[PDB]
From Swiss-Prot, chain A:
This is T-complex protein 1 subunit epsilon. It comes from the Eukaryota. ATP binds at T28, T29. Component of the chaperonin-containing T-complex (TRiC), a hexadecamer composed of two identical back-to-back stacked rings enclosing a protein folding chamber. Each ring is made up of eight different subunits: TCP1/CCT1, CCT2, CCT3, CCT4, CCT5, CCT6A/CCT6, CCT7, CCT8. Interacts with PACRG. Interacts with DNAAF4. Interacts with DLEC1. Interacts with SPMAP2. The gene is CCT5. Ubiquitinated by the DCX(DCAF12) complex specifically recognizes the diglutamate (Glu-Glu) at the C-terminus, leading to its degradation. It comes from Homo sapiens. Mg(2+) binds at D26. Induction: Down-regulated in response to enterovirus 71 (EV71) infection (at protein level). The chain holds residues 79 to 155 of 541 of the full protein. Belongs to the TCP-1 chaperonin family.
From Swiss-Prot, chain B:
This is T-complex protein 1 subunit alpha. It comes from Homo sapiens (Human). It is found in: Cytoplasm, Cytosol; Cytoplasm, Cytoskeleton, Microtubule organizing center, Centrosome. Disulfide bonds: none annotated. The chain holds residues 2 to 112 of 556 of the full protein. The lineage of its organism: Eukaryota, Metazoa, Chordata, Craniata, Vertebrata. The modification Phosphoserine is found at S5.
Curated annotation (Swiss-Prot), chain E:
Belongs to the TCP-1 chaperonin family. Mg(2+) binds at D86. ADP binds at G35, G87, T88, T89, S90, N154, S155, K156. ATP binds at G35, G87, T88, K156. It comes from the Eukaryota. It comes from Homo sapiens (Human). The modification N6-acetyllysine is found at K3. The modification Omega-N-methylarginine is found at R1. This is T-complex protein 1 subunit delta. The gene is CCT4. Its main location: cytoplasm. Component of the chaperonin-containing T-complex (TRiC), a hexadecamer composed of two identical back-to-back stacked rings enclosing a protein folding chamber. Each ring is made up of eight different subunits: TCP1/CCT1, CCT2, CCT3, CCT4, CCT5, CCT6A/CCT6, CCT7, CCT8. Interacts with PACRG. Interacts with DNAAF4. Interacts with DLEC1.
Curated annotation (Swiss-Prot), chain G:
Keywords: Acetylation, ATP-binding, Chaperone, Cytoplasm, Hydrolase, Isopeptide bond, Nucleotide-binding, Phosphoprotein, Ubl conjugation. The chain holds residues 2 to 214 of 535 of the full protein. ATP binds at G43, G97, T98, T99. Its main location: cytoplasm. One of its GO terms (biological process) is chaperone mediated protein folding independent of cofactor. This is T-complex protein 1 subunit beta. It is found in: Cytoplasm. The modification N-acetylalanine is found at A1. Mg(2+) binds at D96. The modification Phosphoserine is found at S2, S59. One of its GO terms (cellular component) is azurophil granule lumen. The modification N6-acetyllysine is found at K12, K153, K180. GO terms for molecular function: ATP binding; ATP hydrolysis activity; ATP-dependent protein folding chaperone; protein folding chaperone; ubiquitin protein ligase binding; unfolded protein binding.
């Protein structure tokens, strides 16, 4: 929020972190690192010639898998 | 620009193909009106009042001040036809431009 | 950030997680010896992690789905 | 009052006068900037720098050489200029130590800044530094070892020194390979120190391991047109004659006649003069003729008809190297052939390297000259390989002159620091404190060597300091595993000349920079 | 023990990443001119001198690249043009790709020295592998020579005329070398004379001599 | 002589992946990186040909694993095949020098840690 | 890569992003500049500074008070701003120690620069500094002495503390005089801490010893 | 054990650098006097301090050199705290000045 960005993708990342803060109030730095990493890997996938939408769909699928696995390994307090 | 850092501009893909076709088409539309017994002549004024009337396509494309390379190619084509044959300098330009047009249409279809 | 070697530490803890089924094995950022976060009392909220994953994936999707930009680009005041 | 901060300013528009604290401030920050710049290239694990000059050519260099780095930077700090000149002088004297002297001077000035902050006069510091330099000189000289007598042990020292010099440079990939080259290249000189004799040809393409040391000699010149291309049992006349419309040195001489017939007769006489010159040459009984100057069409034709290979436009360097490698005499007069010594080589052929043809002299007689062919993937790689080879060859020449060696890997610096510490703890006053700072800088040299690899510099320098305090005068850094070891066994040895010059030049430049209490700049011309 | 080396400085890593990015940018810029289905690039010099080409060395030398790593790739392609005269695009693409891989390696927290040495190891193994794959050939095997020339020409604008320029390109080399003793070729022995006019179907292999210098006599031409 | 159509790059990628699996340590990761990096030339050939680079390169890896080391990208048929039937051959020196020079330049560039403006 | 040294710049015209070494560089040099500024005013023989403001009034102050000096300077370094605010907070909490705290922070940051040069993480540094702060707090508390019970000994401690506070300041010329003043002025409050109750009228003229309560 | 010991030693050096500066400002041998003081406080003379009249070491209890525990504790804690917060910084992202 304090960062003076002019790149619209940096603005999207600012909005992402603010969204994590609104919904949760923690994780505001993990979300940005994780999204950056996902795009960094999409970079190699696009280099190999995959359609960016296929990348987005594989990411959605894997995200569903990870969410259910979190529900699975979760603990209660 | 950006990653490359080359000190110049870069056109790539359908953009530059469209540009090349536009240039060739421009050159062909310059001379299309001077083809056949019903074609008409052209005036050319040389920025100083020096006037040149002509129907010769090679002459027309020689007098023009062209900057695009895809159009310089067609000018050189008309020049080459004028050197090697002496007639057909307009038809050759028109045909080259039309081949470029249809071939770019095919390349857009991803042939 | 803790000075450890990323690949070494991560591969070791991944191998341990696979062998001894234990999703509480992670990075000893404070160097307490143990890799067991359930013992170190390192605790995150399930909704927190799930929201991180969901938000990162959704925004990565919206970003990969963009393939054209048209800024003012005027360099105005 | 003061020169600048006075009610009246006494200077022309644009000049200035930095006083005591401001002067030492600019001096120390400039010197320490230079030093922190040139380090990280120090040691086996040192990394290269890019010299992206902004000129109209934008030359590009990738170097680990401290001398080149400092030469190729626009410096404006005067103390930094002093350190730059110091590194240039190191590069001139010997071929190594250009980064070590700079880092050492910078560390000494850092410690001197610390001491001045301690409210110490910059005279007491220099006094202690002189005493410490004396102690260090004695410790170094006493630890030095000489093996020039035993030929095999001397070969071992040469191989080890070349290896230590190339360890820091891009050639450490193929160190052993280039080590052999460098050693052979200096041994072909047979005691001479002429490094101009060692020619280095940089041919783009191929790997760096395709580089080699030609058993004979290579020349990048051309053979004549109708002249042979291969010669066995070649007898060679090396010359510095005209053979190019050679005119009588009388300059007022002019042909003034009344008939074109006489002009033609005089032209024919000129040609007959050139022919008689060529015949005097051929009376030496030769098959190859190398001229420093050009060879025009008529003498080319004559040499071709005579069956002689006439190589033209060799340079002063080409003819000197040919005289050294073949045994001939550079000649400009041919009226006493019995006095002109010819060169001999079993074979002169034409060879391909990359996409270029070169004259190859094999079976040469003397060999006191060399040709090194450097292959590489990029001109920057080639230039850095030439610089590294020059370093190694210069050091091996300096060692052949003076076989004194001193162990490296921080052993020498730690030893000198140990001697300075012994001196310091027995000395009363603030000179002891300045001696301790001298010792800290000496210790900060191996500290940096270790840092550049990524090891626990503090731990290793502590181990080394303890070893050199115990009496294990050969303890040094083993940079393969990152431990301490015996430099005598691992083969990490340096030229005593180089290390002594490092010490003395660094201490001397730091001394001259420390004596300054005022910097009076004049209005820049620009 | 506990923590390792802090690495108080980040500019070295920034420099490494900038070099890798520049190299990958060059590689991905010329990736399109690779193969029989690869296309040409037009390059208009500052003076306006146009150049259409599929050659990687020419492409990189002609575009006035500015980043140091990209300059080094230009020199690399030139070195390949010298040593082999073929492969000036593949070599740049390979270099760019190795550097783009060094990106993720560095990220993992590996030292550039380890990366370089491991690359040397992989290089030695790959030289071994390629040598194993190869098959020997006799220079009398004209079919292999014709096929090599055709393969070399498939990537270029002169590929519809390959049927004409492959036999010429093999005859030319086979006329300037003794096939029994030759260990190399000097292509300055092969003169190329570019004359406007006609079409590429008019290219010729003249065993004798050709000169652009004019004849001074009028009436004596033959 | 060596086959073309990206066959040497594919064989190289595969066999160095194996070599990497044998070199357990941190050199293993770097050798696997070298292999996957060399796998980019076939991917590029496929992309430019107009095929699906991922599927084409996976078919190539699989067929080279079966043992047809002279298998490459037939842009005439549009897929994978024995490339010698299309008569795509090139000198071994080309591939060898490309590998050597690229590796040397990469090692040189990795030894750099600063840039100065002389 | 990096935020600024990236092929694309991600910032508006005029912004910037100093990274790891450059950030610690600016931070340490700014803090140490602030500290070297405010020292030399430290202790009985400390000397004063002139606060020749450049405003349209050109206010003029002569101070040995670190809080005032730091408040009245145009700072642009963020770390220096941190130290400035720290001295202001010291002046708010108690009325002394603004130069001792500023110098201490600056010296700690100097030593931290030295340690970072030794290739140490500034987390190991902050951890060790927290441990050292604990040890120092216990040593201070253990050495502290209390005399508020004995009325006469308390008067002696008050006189001594007032003397020690005025020793560093321009009033050390007539320290004893002003010491008595300050003590009486604080004893007239009868336990209250309201310093607004103590009015100080500044009348130009006369000597500094003509001052009285 | 460890580099935390080194950072503790630096903390101690800064604490020592406070009286060093106090002594410098008068013109005495700060090094000599702080060395004497360090040796005394290692010996157990917890009341040894600077006597700035003559420039020596003395008994603060006798000379009447005492400070408020509140003041010294706040000095210590605020200084250490600000140094901690300044040391945690690895990036400075400034915004376009107004
Ligand atoms: N004591 C700890 N030990 C190990 N990991 C931790 C500890 N505290 C936090 N982490 C990890 O650090 C990450 C970042 O947490 P933090 O910086 O507190 O908030 P954010 O997630 O918003 O950055 C979390 O993903 C968590 O897993
Ligand atoms: N009398 C004619 N009747 C029909 N067609 C003609 C006649 N004369 C010329 N043409 C056609 O017009 C075309 C172009 O003629 P022209 O413009 O005169 O030559 P150019 O194309 O060289 O300028 C020719 O291809 C020819 O077929
Ligand atoms: N194997 C090794 N072990 C320990 N130290 C080494 C080894 N090889 C080289 N060195 C050290 O590395 C240093 C290389 O320094 P160099 O970069 O040549 O300095 P300069 O440029 O000043 O000559 C030498 O001082 C030597 O002491
Ligand atoms: N007809 C073909 N079918 C399939 N692959 C081919 C054919 N012709 C060439 N190739 C392959 O395409 C590549 C073309 O590379 P090219 O662009 O010439 O590389 P460079 O420009 O680096 O020499 C060669 O590596 C070769 O293996
Ligand atoms: N007679 C004395 N002998 C020794 N030290 C003294 C004497 N009088 C004052 N001091 C010291 O001088 C210092 C004065 O500090 P001061 O300038 O008030 O610092 P700050 O502005 O940070 O409060 C005190 O820390 C005290 O320790
Ligand atoms: Mg007509
Ligand atoms: Mg060296
Ligand atoms: Mg090709
Ligand atoms: Mg006070």
């Amino acid at each position: 929020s304090m960062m003076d960005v002019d790149h619209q993708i940096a603005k999207l990342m600012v909005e992402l972190s603010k969204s994590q803060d609104d919904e949760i109030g923690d994780g505001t730095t993990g979300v940005v690192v994780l999204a950056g990493a996902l795009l960094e890997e999409a970079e190699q996938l696009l280099d190999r010639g995959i359609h960016p939408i296929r990348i987005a769909d594989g990411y959605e699928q894997a995200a569903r898998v990870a969410i259910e696995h979190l529900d699975k390994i979760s603990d209660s307090v | 620009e950006g990653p490359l850092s080359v000190f110049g501009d870069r056109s790539t893909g359908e953009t530059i193909r469209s540009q090349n076709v536009m240039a060739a088409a421009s050159i062909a539309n310059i001379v299309k009106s001077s083809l056949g017994p019903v074609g008409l002549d052209k005036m050319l004024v040389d920025d100083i009042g020096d006037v040149t009337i002509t129907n010769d396509g090679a002459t027309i494309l020689k007098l023009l001040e062209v900057e695009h390379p895809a159009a310089k190619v067609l000018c050189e084509l008309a020049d080459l036809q004028d050197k090697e044959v002496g007639d057909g300098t307009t038809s050759v330009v028109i045909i080259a431009a039309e081949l470029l047009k249809n071939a770019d249409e095919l390349v857009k279809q991803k042939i | 950030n803790s000075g450890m070697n990323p690949i070494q530490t991560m591969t070791e803890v991944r191998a341990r997680q696979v062998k001894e089924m234990n999703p509480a094995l992670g990075i000893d950022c404070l160097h307490k010896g143990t890799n067991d976060m359930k013992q170190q009392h390192v605790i995150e909220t399930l909704i927190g992690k799930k929201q991180q994953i969901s938000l990162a994936t959704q925004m990565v999707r919206m970003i990969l789905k963009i393939d054209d930009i048209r800024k003012p680009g005027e360099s105005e005041e | 009052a003061s020169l600048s901060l006075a009610p009246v300013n006494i200077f022309k528009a644009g000049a200035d006068e930095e006083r005591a604290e401001t002067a030492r401030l600019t001096s120390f920050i400039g010197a320490i900037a230079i030093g922190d710049l040139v380090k990280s290239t120090l040691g086996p694990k040192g990394m290269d720098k890019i010299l992206l000059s902004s000129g109209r050519d934008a030359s590009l260099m990738v170097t680990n050489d401290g001398a080149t780095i400092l030469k190729n930077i626009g410096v404006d700090n005067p103390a930094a200029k002093v350190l730059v000149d110091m590194s240039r002088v190191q590069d001139d004297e010997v071929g190594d130590g250009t980064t070590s002297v700079t880092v050492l001077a910078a560390e000494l000035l850092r410690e001197a800044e610390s001491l001045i902050a301690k409210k110490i006069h910059p005279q007491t510091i220099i006094a202690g530094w002189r005493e410490a330099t004396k102690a260090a000189r004695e410790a170094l000289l006493s630890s030095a070892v000489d093996h020039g007598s035993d030929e095999v042990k001397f070969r071992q020292d040469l191989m080890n020194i070349a290896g230590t010099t190339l360890s820091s440079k891009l050639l450490t990939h193929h160190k052993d390979h280039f080590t052999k080259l460098a050693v052979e290249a200096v041994l072909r000189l047979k005691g001479s120190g002429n490094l101009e004799a060692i020619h280095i040809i940089k041919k783009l393409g191929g790997s760096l391991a395709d580089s080699y040391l030609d058993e004979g000699f290579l020349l990048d010149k051309k053979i004549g047109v109708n002249q042979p291309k291969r010669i066995e049992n070649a007898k060679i006349l090396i010359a510095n004659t005209g053979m190019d419309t050679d005119k009588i040195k009388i300059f007022g001489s002019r042909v003034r006649v009344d008939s074109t017939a006489k002009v033609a007769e005089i032209e024919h006489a000129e040609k007959e003069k050139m022919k008689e010159k060529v015949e005097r040459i051929l009376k030496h009984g030769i098959n190859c003729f190398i001229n420093r100057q050009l060879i025009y069409n008529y003498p080319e034709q004559l040499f071709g008809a005579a069956g002689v290979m006439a190589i033209e436009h060799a340079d002063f360097a080409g003819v000197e190297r040919l005289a050294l490698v073949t045994g001939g005499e550079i000649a400009s007069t041919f009226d006493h052939p019995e006095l002109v010594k010819l060169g001999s080589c079993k074979l002169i052929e034409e060879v391909m390297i990359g996409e270029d043809k070169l004259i190859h002299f094999s079976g040469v007689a003397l060999g006191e000259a060399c040709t090194i062919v450097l292959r590489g993937a990029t001109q920057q790689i080639l230039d850095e390989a030439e610089r590294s080879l020059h370093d190694a060859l210069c050091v091996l020449a300096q060692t052949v002159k003076d076989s004194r060696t001193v162990y490296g890997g921080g052993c020498s610096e730690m030893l000198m620091a140990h001697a300075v510490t012994q001196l310091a703890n027995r000395t009363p006053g603030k000179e002891a404190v300045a001696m301790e700072s001298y010792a800290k800088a000496l210790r900060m040299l191996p500290t940096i060597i270790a840092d550049n690899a990524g090891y626990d510099s503090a731990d290793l320098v502590a181990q080394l300091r303890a070893a050199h305090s115990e009496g294990n005068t050969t303890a040094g850094l083993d940079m393969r595993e990152g431990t301490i070891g015996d430099m005598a066994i691992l083969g990490i040895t340096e030229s005593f000349q180089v290390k002594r010059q490092v010490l003395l030049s660094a201490a001397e430049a730091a001394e001259v920079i420390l004596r300054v209490d005022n910097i009076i700049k004049a209005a820049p011309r620009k | 023990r506990g923590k390792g080396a802090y690495q108080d400085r980040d500019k070295p890593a920034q420099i490494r990443f900038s070099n890798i990015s520049a190299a990958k940018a060059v590689a991905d810029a010329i990736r399109t001119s690779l193969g029989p289905k690869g296309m040409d690039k037009m390059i208009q010099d500052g003076k306006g001198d146009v150049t259409i080409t599929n050659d990687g060395a020419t492409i990189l030398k002609q575009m006035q690249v500015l980043h140091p790593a990209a300059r080094m790739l230009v020199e690399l392609s030139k070195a390949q043009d010298i040593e082999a005269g073929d492969g000036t695009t593949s070599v740049v693409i390979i270099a760019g790709s190795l550097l783009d891989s060094c990106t993720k390696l560095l990220q993992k927290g590996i030292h550039p020295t380890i990366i370089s040495e491991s690359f040397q190891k992989a290089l030695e193994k790959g030289i071994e592998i390629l040598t194993d794959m190869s098959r020997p050939v006799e220079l009398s095997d004209r079919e292999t020579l014709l096929n090599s020339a055709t393969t070399s020409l498939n990537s270029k604008v002169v590929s519809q005329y390959s049927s004409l320029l492959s036999p010429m390109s093999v005859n030319a080399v086979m006329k300037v070398i003794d096939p029994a003793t030759a260990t190399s070729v000097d292509l300055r022995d092969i003169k190329i004379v570019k004359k406007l006019g006609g079409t590429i179907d008019d290219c010729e292999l003249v065993e004798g001599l050709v000169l652009t210098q004019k004849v001074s006599n009028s009436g004596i031409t033959r | 002589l060596i086959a073309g159509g990206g066959a040497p790059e594919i064989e190289l990628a595969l066999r160095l992946t194996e070599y990497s699996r044998t070199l357990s340590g941190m050199e293993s990761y770097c050798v696997r990186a070298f292999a996957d990096a060399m796998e980019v030339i076939p991917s590029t050939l496929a992309e430019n040909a107009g095929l699906n680079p991922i599927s084409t390169v996976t078919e190539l890896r699989n067929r080279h694993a079966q043992g047809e080391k002279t298998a490459g990208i037939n842009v005439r048929k549009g897929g994978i095949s024995n490339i010698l039937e299309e008569l795509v051959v090139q000198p071994l020196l080309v591939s060898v020098s490309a590998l050597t020079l690229a590796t040397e330049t990469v090692r040189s560039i990795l030894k750099i840690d600063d840039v100065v403006n002389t």
